[PDB]
Amino acid sequence: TFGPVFEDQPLSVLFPEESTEEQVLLACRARASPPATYRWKMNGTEMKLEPGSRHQLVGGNLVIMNPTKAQDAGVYQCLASNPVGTVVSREAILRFGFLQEFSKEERDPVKAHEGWGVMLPCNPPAHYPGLSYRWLLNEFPNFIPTDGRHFVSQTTGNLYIARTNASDLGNYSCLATSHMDFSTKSVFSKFAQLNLAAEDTRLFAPSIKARFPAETYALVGQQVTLECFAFGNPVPRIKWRKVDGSLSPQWTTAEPTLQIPSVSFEDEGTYECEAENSKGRDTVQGRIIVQAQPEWLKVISDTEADIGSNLRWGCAAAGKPRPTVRWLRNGEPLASQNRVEVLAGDLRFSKLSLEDSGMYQCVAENKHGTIYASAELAVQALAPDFRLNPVRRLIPAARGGEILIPCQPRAAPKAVVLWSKGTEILVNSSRVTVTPDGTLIIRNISRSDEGKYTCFAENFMGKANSTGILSVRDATKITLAPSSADINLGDNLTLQCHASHDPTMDLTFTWTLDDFPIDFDKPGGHYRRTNVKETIGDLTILNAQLRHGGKYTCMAQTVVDSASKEATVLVRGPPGPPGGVVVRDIGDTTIQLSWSRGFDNHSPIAKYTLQARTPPAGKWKQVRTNPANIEGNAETAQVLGLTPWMDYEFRVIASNILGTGEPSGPSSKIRTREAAPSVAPSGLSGGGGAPGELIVNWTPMSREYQNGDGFGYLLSFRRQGSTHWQTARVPGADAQYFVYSNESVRPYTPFEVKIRSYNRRGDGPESLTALVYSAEEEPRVAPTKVWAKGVSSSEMNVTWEPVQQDMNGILLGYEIRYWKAGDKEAAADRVRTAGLDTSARVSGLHPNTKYHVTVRAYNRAGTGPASPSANATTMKPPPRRPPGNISWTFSSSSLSIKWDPVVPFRNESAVTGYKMLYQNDLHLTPTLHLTGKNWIEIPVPEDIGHALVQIRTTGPGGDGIPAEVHIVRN
Amino acid sequence: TFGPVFEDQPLSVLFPEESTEEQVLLACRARASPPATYRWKMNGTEMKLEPGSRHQLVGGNLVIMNPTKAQDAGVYQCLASNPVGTVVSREAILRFGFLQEFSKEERDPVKAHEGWGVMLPCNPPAHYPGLSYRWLLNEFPNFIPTDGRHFVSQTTGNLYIARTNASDLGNYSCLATSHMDFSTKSVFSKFAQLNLAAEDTRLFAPSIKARFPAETYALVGQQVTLECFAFGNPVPRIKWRKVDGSLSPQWTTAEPTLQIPSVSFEDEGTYECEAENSKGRDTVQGRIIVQAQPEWLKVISDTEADIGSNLRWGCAAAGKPRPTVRWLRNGEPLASQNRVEVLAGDLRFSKLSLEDSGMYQCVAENKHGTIYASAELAVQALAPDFRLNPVRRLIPAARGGEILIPCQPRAAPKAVVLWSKGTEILVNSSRVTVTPDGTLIIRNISRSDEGKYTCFAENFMGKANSTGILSVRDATKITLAPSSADINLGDNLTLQCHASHDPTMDLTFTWTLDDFPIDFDKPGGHYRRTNVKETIGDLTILNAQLRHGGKYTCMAQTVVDSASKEATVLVRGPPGPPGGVVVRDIGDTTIQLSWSRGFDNHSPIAKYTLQARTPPAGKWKQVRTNPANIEGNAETAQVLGLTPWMDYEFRVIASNILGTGEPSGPSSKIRTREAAPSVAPSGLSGGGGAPGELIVNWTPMSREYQNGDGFGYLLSFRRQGSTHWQTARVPGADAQYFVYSNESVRPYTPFEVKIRSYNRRGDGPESLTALVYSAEEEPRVAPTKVWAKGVSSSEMNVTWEPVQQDMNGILLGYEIRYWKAGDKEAAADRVRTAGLDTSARVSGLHPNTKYHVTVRAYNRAGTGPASPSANATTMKPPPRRPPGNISWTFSSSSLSIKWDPVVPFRNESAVTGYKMLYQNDLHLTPTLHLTGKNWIEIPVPEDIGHALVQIRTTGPGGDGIPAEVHIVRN
Ligand SMILES: *[C@@H]1O[C@H](CO)[C@@H](O[C@@H]2O[C@H](CO)[C@@H](O)[C@H](O)[C@H]2NC(C)=O)[C@H](O)[C@H]1NC(C)=O
Ligand SMILES: *[C@@H]1O[C@H](CO)[C@@H](O[C@@H]2O[C@H](CO)[C@@H](O)[C@H](O)[C@H]2NC(C)=O)[C@H](O)[C@H]1NC(C)=O
Ligand SMILES: *[C@@H]1O[C@H](CO)[C@@H](O[C@@H]2O[C@H](CO)[C@@H](O)[C@H](O)[C@H]2NC(C)=O)[C@H](O)[C@H]1NC(C)=O
Numbered sequence A, B: 001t002f003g004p005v006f007e008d009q010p011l012s013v014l015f016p017e018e019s020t021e022e023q024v025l026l027a028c029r030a031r032a033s034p035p036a037t038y039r040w041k042m043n044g045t046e047m048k049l050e051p052g053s054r055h056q057l058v059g060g061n062l063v064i065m066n067p068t069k070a071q072d073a074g075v076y077q078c079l080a081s082n083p084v085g086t087v088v089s090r091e092a093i094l095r096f097g098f099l100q101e102f103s104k105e106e107r108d109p110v111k112a113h114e115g116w117g118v119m120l121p122c123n124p125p126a127h128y129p130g131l132s133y134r135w136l137l138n139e140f141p142n143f144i145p146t147d148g149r150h151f152v153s154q155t156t157g158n159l160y161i162a163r164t165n166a167s168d169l170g171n172y173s174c175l176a177t178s179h180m181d182f183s184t185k186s187v188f189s190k191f192a193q194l195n196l197a198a199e200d201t202r203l204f205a206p207s208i209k210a211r212f213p214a215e216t217y218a219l220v221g222q223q224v225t226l227e228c229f230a231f232g233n234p235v236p237r238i239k240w241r242k243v244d245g246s247l248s249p250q251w252t253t254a255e256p257t258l259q260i261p262s263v264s265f266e267d268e269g270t271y272e273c274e275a276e277n278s279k280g281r282d283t284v285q286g287r288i289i290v291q292a293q294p295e296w297l298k299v300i301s302d303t304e305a306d307i308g309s310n311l312r313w314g315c316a317a318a319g320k321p322r323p324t325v326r327w328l329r330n331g332e333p334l335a336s337q338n339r340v341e342v343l344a345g346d347l348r349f350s351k352l353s354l355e356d357s358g359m360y361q362c363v364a365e366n367k368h369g370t371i372y373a374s375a376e377l378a379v380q381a382l383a384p385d386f387r388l389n390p391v392r393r394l395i396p397a398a399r400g401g402e403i404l405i406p407c408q409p410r411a412a413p414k415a416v417v418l419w420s421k422g423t424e425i426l427v428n429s430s431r432v433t434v435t436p437d438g439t440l441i442i443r444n445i446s447r448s449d450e451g452k453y454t455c456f457a458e459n460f461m462g463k464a465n466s467t468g469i470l471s472v473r474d475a476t477k478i479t480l481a482p483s484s485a486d487i488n489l490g491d492n493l494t495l496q497c498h499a500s501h502d503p504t505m506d507l508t509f510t511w512t513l514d515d516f517p518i519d520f521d522k523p524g525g526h527y528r529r530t531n532v533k534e535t536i537g538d539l540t541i542l543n544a545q546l547r548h549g550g551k552y553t554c555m556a557q558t559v560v561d562s563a564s565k566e567a568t569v570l571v572r573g574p575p576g577p578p579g580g581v582v583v584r585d586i587g588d589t590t591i592q593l594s595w596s597r598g599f600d601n602h603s604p605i606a607k608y609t610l611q612a613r614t615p616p617a618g619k620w621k622q623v624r625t626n627p628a629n630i631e632g633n634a635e636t637a638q639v640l641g642l643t644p645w646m647d648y649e650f651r652v653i654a655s656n657i658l659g660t661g662e663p664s665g666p667s668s669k670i671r672t673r674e675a676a677p678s679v680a681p682s683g684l685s686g687g688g689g690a691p692g693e694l695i696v697n698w699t700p701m702s703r704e705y706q707n708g709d710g711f712g713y714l715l716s717f718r719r720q721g722s723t724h725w726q727t728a729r730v731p732g733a734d735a736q737y738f739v740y741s742n743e744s745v746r747p748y749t750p751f752e753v754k755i756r757s758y759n760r761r762g763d764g765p766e767s768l769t770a771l772v773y774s775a776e777e778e779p780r781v782a783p784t785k786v787w788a789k790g791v792s793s794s795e796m797n798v799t800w801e802p803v804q805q806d807m808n809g810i811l812l813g814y815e816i817r818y819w820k821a822g823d824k825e826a827a828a829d830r831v832r833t834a835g836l837d838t839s840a841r842v843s844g845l846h847p848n849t850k851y852h853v854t855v856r857a858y859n860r861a862g863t864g865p866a867s868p869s870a871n872a873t874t875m876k877p878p879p880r881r882p883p884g885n886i887s888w889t890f891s892s893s894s895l896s897i898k899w900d901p902v903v904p905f906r907n908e909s910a911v912t913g914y915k916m917l918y919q920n921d922l923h924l925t926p927t928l929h930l931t932g933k934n935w936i937e938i939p940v941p942e943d944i945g946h947a948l949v950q951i952r953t954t955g956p957g958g959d960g961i962p963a964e965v966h967i968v969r970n
């Protein structure tokens, strides 16, 4: 069974006077089981719906035959009643559409001045709803024309004419037109005669007589038309504006009837109409305040509740002005009662009972409407039933421990729990406690307390019992707790956790660190197990680091019971990271660094070491401070020893006795702000290069040697003994040379050079001061008295005089150019001497060839001109014939080889000696022997069977073509 | 309907051979609806329970008529079947009690040596259960005697004599005695002849032949009897002990059958029997392992579950050895399947179906028993019903926001949710999201989504729908967020929170600080509200202190939505308390303090001040520290300027720009370690006191000035010009005097004194060095030539000579003792002089009285002896008579009074002058005038009409009694 919820509710109807329908159907039907009897209210009094009267109840719907205004106007309200409860439908305000005949008094004629406006009232009769107005210039259907001169009001119905003349006279009357659901009716008014006085020929101010009202209250969605009609001479314009904002541009008109099609909450504000002509102005202000019909936000639903519970029914509604939410119970109003609290808002039941069952209604209300929301409260009384939440049937307990056994059945209301051990009914005492929600508490469990525990349940509906079996075991306790420990990094540490338990059961050890479980199977695994038995749970931390410090909880558990002990391990006293490296006090080579502190678990910080780099070019090398060991309580120390014009990043390392710690993040890229150079140019050399010019050369210097901005070289050069110093000022790094030449500077001139650097703010220090000379030129003095003589077939000797010193500088050597007989100078071979010698030897020549020799002189700059020539002829070639009649005699340790001397031909040279290569069986390499005559002796030992003898000639002709003689000993 | 759960279960029966009952009755009945069919199993296969056979099913209970060993001995098991499921009862091991007849083989006679022990076997037959053995020395009922020589075994039953002789011979026989449930049977064995050899007359070792076994496996509650019987000459003692502990003393016997009535788990261990006599010893070892039947811990219950859900039934048991928990479904074994997972432990269903409904049994098993636990799984297929968790019937939304509409009915299985906007069905797109669990997600909601949303639900069971109204409202947003702020203590601060919302609803502001709600109504309230409108919700913190800083969260809420912004306020950068102040480096006046850091939020710590007290005597004053302001990075400064011996507690104060901070907890009660005094005793004085003795008096000198331990005073005293110094050494502070007197020291002797202090380790500094004298004594020289003369009636003058200097010291004055004529020295009046005068005046005397005058001399010590006496007589009294014949004459400004002179009597003195007092009308006080004759002139002005004149006499006799004259002018 359920209470009545509506499917259709009664609507407000507009019944016309000229209706073709004799009945009014106010529809109401609510679904129900059993189907409801339906009562109707009229103005708070109940309608006696007798059969055969004019107010019949046809199917629930109220049918009213032939209504008139003094009998059936009012408010109507459907009440659906079953014996669950009574609900109230929303109110149907039955309004009568009627149009009365016009006012039959003899109205006065209207007198006004010509040239002004005129004011004729309509005086409309009593009506519903709001009429539409036009007037009549004559009989029907001759209306007033619609223009900018005649203005018809839809609020008061009067026609407003701005300026009148004598063509506007006519048969003036009012007219009304109403459009309704079943009929259309219009009715003519009384005759109005208008008379005009003499003409006031002036130009004057506008006078707005049609006033749009001061607080126009609109609902959301109502069409609102404001009116601002003006008198005056001449014709005024009408402007509409918004004072506190701007008009929305979907309906902006320059018309005296401003029409909004749908008024919403953004159109609320202060409005202004302005009339203005050529001679005056008039301003009229007003307001539109937008209100709302109530709509629901949070309503109530059909809740199933137990007897005795706390039920809070919140119910809220939104609308403008904000709705007084009130409550109905079963068609009657519900105030605050003995168990019922209404805060005009939530409905809070203190203790529920079975007389609170019924249809309750949330009603919201303001002056624009009244809305309703129904719910059923079904208060239920139940038997206790243990099929959803019973007592635990087969129960563990420990010896010396605690047991929480609840007995909470699905009972409405809260059942009387009387515990029993078998047949013995348990009473509260010093050991056994029956808490009156149902929970039995037994302290100090032994083996006399095991048994068959039955929880009884009782309310007025019925009874049930649920029976649990208590078994007493041994208690799991830790016999050897893990103690606190203090280690280092890299140490191994076990934590002892033995346990003792009942030997029927099983015992697992779970170790938790800071209430997170231990992952034994991590890659790079640290935690491992030692000494496996059943009841030994020793975790051994292997290669302990900083994340293994914290609280340890060895939980020995069975499936029924758990016991835990506490251990606290602290691993390293960490030389940790400092944070926020702040660079202060920026100087030339002096810079201030400040940092944060580290950590002090085992030990406080012993020292701070300081590091720097030039990023990204340079790396981390240790820089110097004063004091040279930074003391460990100092968060700031100042650092020296810097080389400027590089960017820098600074980090700091904390240290302890447990190892030098990992460093911090470096600081910001701080800029050096120098004012001085201090590094001299190195690698200074001078002299040489171009002839006649002073060229000084030196090394390039990179970024660590230059110091600062505006870098270049100051090379200072002057003549030895001169009183004038010349200074070169060239910027850049690539200019590693300077050339000075002048018309008064000759070759071999001594100069004094030194070099320093410069920057934007100073001059550099001095280099090595040395005396250099200007470079020499190529010579012009030829060699004299060149005489040549051949000494062999491939060598000749060329001699020349030691010549005088040239004007172009320093002579260093001589150059020999030579070519054959009949050849030229362009195919010559050029052989230079190693020094200033008066003679040299031309070697590598052909035999019997005449040569032409020219001697030139050279130095470092170039080669001078040629000498007068000399001629020489090489010696004859050696003879290609072998020596004849070769004989040999052996001995016990020697071999003597004799031969005839060589007689040459006419084109061959003489032989003054012989050379011989000798190879035997015991050696793989030949040996050289020399002689001056035609016989020789060589040692041959007794193991040699045969030998290889090659005989060639030597002398002034050169080495000849050798023979090859094979000598067998036996 | 429900499956079968058992009420009675089949017990294992022991059916004897001599039973009076022709049947066995293994009972099995389970409660059911529809009622269960009971099948039976025997040796792993089913019993064909035909009617009319020997295996009848009477009511579910199996009745077997006339059982024998080869036909019906086995394992019986009841199966209760309904079409919910099938359960299996636990096994009834039907074992038979039987006693077979004895061995009919011709057994051999037992032969051993006399003087030894002998073992006669029983050879017991096949039997069940465990027999009780007694024996036969003769025919029945002549048994063996029970003593400490015949030993009765229960495991093997053989005969054990410790020492035999020839009186133990006879026709030996075994016997057995079994006690059963329905019968008692005892049968007789074969005859045994005992023959013995010649006697081995020796004393030898014990020999335990009857050995208690190597692992005796006991259950919990079984009675265990071990056996240790020994041979030997003489008869040995039998001791039982536990090897790994001690025996429990409730059953300790010095008997060869160790008897435990109930073996529990504390008897598990190794056991030891020791046989020992006068000539040898024997030891044997064994063990008792206590095992257990399985009992349950966590079982399974009757669970209704939805189709398609995940279900985990855990099931665990306790017992030794630990039970292989396996599963039965419907009387058949249940392995791991496609949806059913068995881990031999918990049972996991992946996806349920309707074919998984049935009775499931959980079976625990070892070698000591098998236990069962039944449960029902009822897989429910349900229609979707929205009567318990519907769709929200009236849904509010924000424009531009977000809504989640869940559709989760009570449906088995998970229903198909297909949302609709009325009749238009909803497809997933980029704006509307229909999730497969049922939640409809609409982002960026405008007023085209306002509608009548219907959730649909579909499975194979049925169709249901629930319908919700979506209304589209404007979003609550914050137009002016609260910004972060930086203040001081004592500054006022307003956090702006303007909101914007639709005008139908109401807008409340909840301000939460660090997710705790702000209490405006605290005593000493700081948070107040400013500038009240509807949508303006700014909070103003007034007198803001240090707990008002943190995360502020302004939450504008309606009842349908919320909007929150964050503001962070920092209030003061505190000079907080430093914690754990540590005193190091304990010296004399130098002491080292180290403390912790504070806070640096606004500003860091500018300075540290150090204060101290001496508790409970001294208070908090600022002590001096080098350096004179402690810098803000310094946690350690050295503090000086202390006064020693005293206990101290040192407190530290941090300070900054924002005020002098709250001071810390002070340190420990630290004690300095001084060894030097530096304060001389002040206020030094000498002289006076006792006569003839040198007494030095000075100020007692308190414990803030005394410095070190072992305190006392060194007073150094010597004679002026003496070469010997005397030094006093008195400890204690109350001795403020020292007396030196000697036989060679006379009065008026000069002395030189100075004082210093001492302690345990040194001497104090010098005081003021002054020359004092020894104190004088009382004199002995009398005054000489005392002469007296009266000068008036009340005065006389006593003169004496200036006497010489006494031997007792210094004279300072004189003392006059005087009494009347006839009186004595004991009632005399004593008048002392103020110095060394030669004359003094005794005044205050009576007229006409003779006096006796004695003059003594005095000083500071005492008064010396008397002089020779002198006598003097005072003169006559003044006359008491008034002056007669008083006449007066007035003038313009004066009054002259004349009188006769006074003629005295013979006992009265003469009158040489007059004194008078005058009082008039204009003055309230009298005025005194003097005259030397018998007339006087007084000034009387003209306004005085009455005068008061009193006239008395004066002279050498004294002032007389006045008269009283009243003078009237007119
Ligand atoms: C029920 O209530 C309505 C409203 O109070 C009554 O209607 C009014 O009747 C008088 C006289 O006929 C009119 O002047 C009012 O203008 C009516 N007001 C409205 C809002 O219609 C009605 O008469 C009451 N019914 C009865 C039977 O008295
Ligand atoms: C056993 O102990 C409980 C707890 O001490 C008792 O419960 C209290 O009963 C009174 C009266 O109903 C309540 O006002 C208390 O609040 C209860 N205490 C708690 C903690 O719930 C209980 O009454 C005792 N049983 C008997 C039979 O006396
Ligand atoms: C509407 O959106 C949801 C969420 O994106 C879609 O649900 C997913 O469907 C597939 C196929 O069943 C699942 O594998 C995913 O896990 C689902 N996502 C989530 C978050 O649960 C849904 O299919 C979409 N609707 C339609 C009609 O396409």
Ligand SMILES: *[C@@H]1O[C@H](CO)[C@@H](O)[C@H](O)[C@H]1NC(C)=O
Residues within 6 Å of the ligand: A490, A491, A492, A542, A543
């Ligand atoms: C214990 O620690 C040391 C140092 O870390 C290590 O060398 C050693 O191998 C560790 N012991 C074991 C058993 O791993």
